[PDB]
Design a protein around this ligand. Structure first.
Ligand SMILES: COc1ccccc1-c1nnco1
Ligand SMILES: COc1ccccc1-c1nnco1
Ligand SMILES: [Cl-]
Ligand SMILES: [Zn+2]
Ligand SMILES: [Zn+2]
Length: 567
């Protein structure tokens, strides 16, 4: 404990030896407390082209603006045995066609020169060019090999930002989980890593085709706060598939950063509290998505075991039950994984039958308490895959004029328009703001083409931003391109779509269908309102307002792609 965190604490104390004090009025009960020292904007391009939404509070309010300090109990021995056996088996299946390996300074740099979230000289782009930086990384690296840590400290402020060296060492040991697609559907059977929002609907419809009960989609209440040290230890078992230096490097990240956290927090009363804890996910973990998917996969298989009566009690797992659990995993494990879609803490399960709905003992004792339902109330499942929520979306089964079947993602249009009106960060030029507006417009044309208001606004934004300006943004992002959007649509929805047998390209946007008008209004369309009919009729005037602001550039008119504007 203090042997593992003291060095980190000792170093921070010394760097602020003039302001250190063991404050007696600290709000921490479940976080160990050590001491203290002394210490959204609106996108105008999108907003000017979505004027009807200026008076919709669900849109406008999105742009305005005690669970971490909690303690989950040690699971019963029967639960701990259920997890350990499932986790050992799960790492084995994930590793059958994948090779754990170290990630490199070289591939780590290709991310810093591509402006990706690293959780980190002025910027990360500077420090990587300097060899003095890497001389410090080696200091720490060598420390980790000697079972010690000095500078890997989390900074509470959405992400816990670290010194660039700690973000590499984490990427070095565990990045393979991310970049080698361990949670791909092909590899993990439950996962959807890299699948893309145009595949999730088809994936849920394939789960629907299985024989069984309702589809269950129970959200966990603060998943990250509910991660036990037993979960963290089952996650560490990935090191059993590793070797040499990699194994030592990964074991250290697990032992010294994950299973013992050190965090520097702000407190207005403004001191920097230095707190520590062994459990929870926290933030700061670059493989949070992957390890959440892993632990959720494990929890959901055990819940499936409980519904099938593979075991009677969580209090003590009997050895006859132990072999039965192992025999279940080996004979039907893969079949039960294929009955799920799991994205981090998010899941959809189509179990063998509806006993799953009241199989709650293991799930509650693992600490994965369901959101907004009494602890022992049975889960309410969905009878129709087109109603199940997943990754903040639902999915419509749309029919093209020619009988081919699109499965399309959808959410409340107020949520889509409200997010596109927001920019994160400072120092945006007009040109940068317009290129972000164009990324949203191209995303809408690819994913939400079936919503009347989003096709029209997306065409208006692409008409209002210079044709050749590149979309920017500080799973799959096929809208991030200057290629023609009809061509990308044909690639994504027809050519590369493994659920479409007939590969005949579409030759115009008018051959690409909308939802029914009533279904469009149900999902938030303003089609039918006077404000929307004025907006639509006078759209060239809004486009010209934004063209005048940006100035004398090469623009294309995309509105004639819509039949009504086509003269
Ligand atoms: C956005 O992801 C990251 C990228 C880099 C470093 C950390 C994270 C992270 N931490 N917790 C969740 O993510
Ligand atoms: C699979 O997710 C990632 C891929 C790449 C980089 C970071 C992440 C991540 N961040 N927090 C969780 O995962
Ligand atoms: Cl339903
Ligand atoms: Zn360290
Ligand atoms: Zn919808």
């Amino acid at each position: 404990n203090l042997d593992i965190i003291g060095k980190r604490i000792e170093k921070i104390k010394q760097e602020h030896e003039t302001s250190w004090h063991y404050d007696q009025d600290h709000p921490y009960k479940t976080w160990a407390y050590h001491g203290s020292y002394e210490t959204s904007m609106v996108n105008g391009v999108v907003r000017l082209l979505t004027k009807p939404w200026d008076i919709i509070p669900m849109v406008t309010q999105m742009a305005m603006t005690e669970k971490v300090d909690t303690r989950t109990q040690e699971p019963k021995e029967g639960t701990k045995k259920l997890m350990k056996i499932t986790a050992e088996w799960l790492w084995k299946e994930l590793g059958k066609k994948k090779t754990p390996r170290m990630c490199t300074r070289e591939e780590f740099t290709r991310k810093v020169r591509s402006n990706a979230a690293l959780g980190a000289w002025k910027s990360a782009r500077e420090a990587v060019e300097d060899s003095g930086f890497w001389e410090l990384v080696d200091k720490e690296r060598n420390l980790h090999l000697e079972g010690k840590c000095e500078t890997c400290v989390y900074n509470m402020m959405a992400i816990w930002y670290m010194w660039l060296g700690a973000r590499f060492l984490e990427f070095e040991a565990l990045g393979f989980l991310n970049e080698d697609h361990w949670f791909s559907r092909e590899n993990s059977l439950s996962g959807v890593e890299g699948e893309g929002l145009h595949k999730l609907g088809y994936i849920l419809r394939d789960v629907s085709k299985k024989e069984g009960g309702a589809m269950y989609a129970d959200d966990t209440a603060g998943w990250d706060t509910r991660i036990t040290l037993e979960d963290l230890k089952n996650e560490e078992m990935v090191t059993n598939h590793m070797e040499g230096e990699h194994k030592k490097l990964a074991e250290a990240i697990f032992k010294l950063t994950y299973q013992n956290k050190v965090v520097r927090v702000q407190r207005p009363t403004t001191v920097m509290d230095i707190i520590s804890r062994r459990d929870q996910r926290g933030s700061g973990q670059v493989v949070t998505y992957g390890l959440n998917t892993f632990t959720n996969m494990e929890a959901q298989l055990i819940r499936q075991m409980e519904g099938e009566g593979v075991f009677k009690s969580i209090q003590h797992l009997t050895v006859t039950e132990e072999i039965a659990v192992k025999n279940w995993l080996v004979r039907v494990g893969r079949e039960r994984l294929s009955r799920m879609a799991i994205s981090g803490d998010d899941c959809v399960v189509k179990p063998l039958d509806d006993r799953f709905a009241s199989a709650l003992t293991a799930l509650n004792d693992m600490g994965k308490v369901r959101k907004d339902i009494q602890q022992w109330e049975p889960s309410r499942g969905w009878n129709d895959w087109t109603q199940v929520p997943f990754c903040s979306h639902h999915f419509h089964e749309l029919i093209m004029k020619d009988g081919r079947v699109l499965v399309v993602p959808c959410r409340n249009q107020d949520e889509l328009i409200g997010r596109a009106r927001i920019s994160q960060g400072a120092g945006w030029s007009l040109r940068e703001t317009a290129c972000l507006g164009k990324s949203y417009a191209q995303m809408w044309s690819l994913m939400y083409f079936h919503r009347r208001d989003l096709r029209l606004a997306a065409n208006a934004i692409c008409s209002a931003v210079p044709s050749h300006w590149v979309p920017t943004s500080r799973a799959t992002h096929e809208w991030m391109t200057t290629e023609d959007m009809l061509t990308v649509w044909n690639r994504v929805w027809i050519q590369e779509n493994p659920w479409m047998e007939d590969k005949t390209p579409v030759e115009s946007w008018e051959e690409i269908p909308y939802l029914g008008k009533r279904e469009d209004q149900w999902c938030g369309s303003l089609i039918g309102l006077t404000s929307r009919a004025t907006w639509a009729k006078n759209i060239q005037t809004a486009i010209n307002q934004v063209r005048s602001l940006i100035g004398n550039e090469e623009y294309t008119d995309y509105m004639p792609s819509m039949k009504r504007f086509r003269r």
